[PDB]
Design an enzyme around this catalytic site. Sequence first.
Site, short mmCIF file in Angstrom:
data_model
loop_
_atom_site.label_atom_id
_atom_site.label_comp_id
_atom_site.label_asym_id
_atom_site.label_seq_id
_atom_site.Cartn_x
_atom_site.Cartn_y
_atom_site.Cartn_z
N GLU A 172 0.83 -1.19 0.00
CA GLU A 172 0.00 0.00 0.00
C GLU A 172 0.87 1.25 0.00
O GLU A 172 0.61 2.20 -0.74
CB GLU A 172 -0.97 0.03 1.18
CG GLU A 172 -2.00 1.15 1.05
CD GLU A 172 -2.75 1.44 2.34
OE1 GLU A 172 -2.12 1.42 3.42
OE2 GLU A 172 -3.97 1.72 2.26
N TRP A 199 -8.39 -1.81 -0.84
CA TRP A 199 -8.99 -0.70 -1.58
C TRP A 199 -10.05 -1.12 -2.61
O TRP A 199 -10.65 -0.26 -3.27
CB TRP A 199 -7.91 0.15 -2.26
CG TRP A 199 -7.16 1.01 -1.29
CD1 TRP A 199 -5.99 0.70 -0.66
CD2 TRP A 199 -7.52 2.32 -0.85
NE1 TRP A 199 -5.60 1.74 0.15
CE2 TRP A 199 -6.52 2.75 0.05
CE3 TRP A 199 -8.59 3.18 -1.14
CZ2 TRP A 199 -6.56 4.00 0.68
CZ3 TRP A 199 -8.63 4.44 -0.51
CH2 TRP A 199 -7.62 4.83 0.39
N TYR A 216 -4.59 9.04 -1.61
CA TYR A 216 -3.26 9.44 -1.08
C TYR A 216 -2.15 9.61 -2.10
O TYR A 216 -1.49 10.64 -2.12
CB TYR A 216 -2.81 8.50 0.06
CG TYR A 216 -3.73 8.56 1.27
CD1 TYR A 216 -3.78 9.70 2.07
CD2 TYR A 216 -4.55 7.48 1.60
CE1 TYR A 216 -4.63 9.76 3.17
CE2 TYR A 216 -5.41 7.53 2.69
CZ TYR A 216 -5.44 8.67 3.47
OH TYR A 216 -6.27 8.72 4.56
N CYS A 242 -8.40 10.00 5.69
CA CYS A 242 -8.40 10.03 7.15
C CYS A 242 -7.09 10.59 7.65
O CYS A 242 -7.04 11.22 8.70
CB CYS A 242 -8.60 8.63 7.74
SG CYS A 242 -10.22 7.94 7.39
N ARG A 262 -7.78 12.55 11.24
CA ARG A 262 -9.06 13.13 11.61
C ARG A 262 -10.05 12.12 12.18
O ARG A 262 -10.97 12.50 12.90
CB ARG A 262 -9.73 13.79 10.41
CG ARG A 262 -10.15 12.82 9.32
CD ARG A 262 -10.88 13.52 8.14
NE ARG A 262 -11.16 12.50 7.12
CZ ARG A 262 -12.18 11.66 7.20
NH1 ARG A 262 -13.05 11.74 8.21
NH2 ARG A 262 -12.34 10.73 6.27
N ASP A 284 -10.40 4.52 13.81
CA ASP A 284 -10.96 3.35 14.45
C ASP A 284 -9.81 2.74 15.21
O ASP A 284 -8.92 2.12 14.62
CB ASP A 284 -11.48 2.37 13.41
CG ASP A 284 -12.16 1.14 14.04
OD1 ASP A 284 -11.69 0.61 15.06
OD2 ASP A 284 -13.21 0.72 13.49
#
Lengths: 248, 244
Positions: free
Chosen positions: A55, A77, A91, A143, A163, A166
């Site tokens: 990733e 994804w 990203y 995020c 922001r 989990d």
Amino acid sequence: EQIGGMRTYLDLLQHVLDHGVDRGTRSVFGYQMRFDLEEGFPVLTTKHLRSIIHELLWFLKGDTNIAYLKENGVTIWDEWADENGDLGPVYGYQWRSWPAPDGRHIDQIANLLKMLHTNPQSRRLIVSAWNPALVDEMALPPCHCLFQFYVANGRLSCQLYQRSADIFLGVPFNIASYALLTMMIAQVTGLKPGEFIHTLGDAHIYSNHFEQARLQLTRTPKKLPVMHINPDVKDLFAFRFEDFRLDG
Amino acid sequence: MRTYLDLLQHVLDHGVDRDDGTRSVFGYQMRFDLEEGFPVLKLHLRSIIHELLWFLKGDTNIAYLKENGVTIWDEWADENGDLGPVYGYQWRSWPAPDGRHIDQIANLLKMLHTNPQSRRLIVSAWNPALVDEMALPPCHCLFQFYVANGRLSCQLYQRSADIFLGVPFNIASYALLTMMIAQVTGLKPGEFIHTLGDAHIYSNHFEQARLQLTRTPKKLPVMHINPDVKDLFAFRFEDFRLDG
């Protein structure tokens, strides 16, 4: 006195259980953790690394097409890919090709590397994935909004502003990824790993995990494995999967 | 304000000395419960208030500040009183790739009414497309709001923080903003969370900071806000009174 990465994460787990306000989720707003990367690689799962590395290499290539991930068996994804496997301006695109109004693209990563070489004491060693002009049109706005670096005593530190986190299912992966990135960047800039500072906005745990999160609160913390990185790589964009080896 | 003094103490005792001289740490976080009083930690609020109101108007011209004897931005203004793409411009008029402008503040207020539970109540002033040409890249990169139990909280990410000369003002400004926004959105003030990147103190301030650690901390003043104001953009300087 149990002190280390796992405990710091376990402290987050515990804080949100005890003081979190439900809304299933349970949450707090504003949290900060520090990890000394020199202590070991912050694997904070009771329990894949393949997904993490690929990733991250995928991010660094500027690719927003799921194909390289699918090619290396990474599915994280998949659920957001369109018919062609495109994700939109996620990203990689923000990091390598931040779109300016005049059509120029800002390679924030390359800019960061140049700035680390010429002005390591700079207070704006920053990459942002938060673009107000594009977030409204994303099904999944980033995020990991923004991260900043810092250099002291030959050590590179990184702070991530996240922001939405989990804490149970996401945060360990989040941590591993930016710790790895920090290590990769430290290497190519001739610096040693410093600290990863994880700053959270909405730090939350869903109600179906309330009880499990406790199975981790008692668990005895294992020694952190060492992430070995191929020391020859000097080009951040040239890393390969095989460049990395984690103990166990 | 203990929380602020702890900041000075931590950097003074554990920060690293680097010459440009400052002593610094990277990554710090302070919480201020805004229901305990206005976190003013003597400091002159008028510039903070005028500047914030000025940010809220979105104009990059210094005229409002000059007219109100606020000099914060003078050194950066050109002959016409124009600054670059400073906070007000990024907040109210973020330049989109396609040529639109994003009013992040208007969108914030909309989102607070429509989805108070949102995890992306964000205003950003950090634009990679702009920062390299700015004479003063924004120190206040991004801030995020949060609503729980009828309370509005705000977290600021500040990349660079002069803990002695700057931070108290930064805290006042965002605390005040949070209170203004809470008022107009029907919410109570929650907490202001201040996250710092490079949190530094200049050597010429070491001893004054040390001395501040001794001062016996007093009950926080209350910031009174004209309760009749229902529109964030209708606030005026006269609507604020710090008492107690």
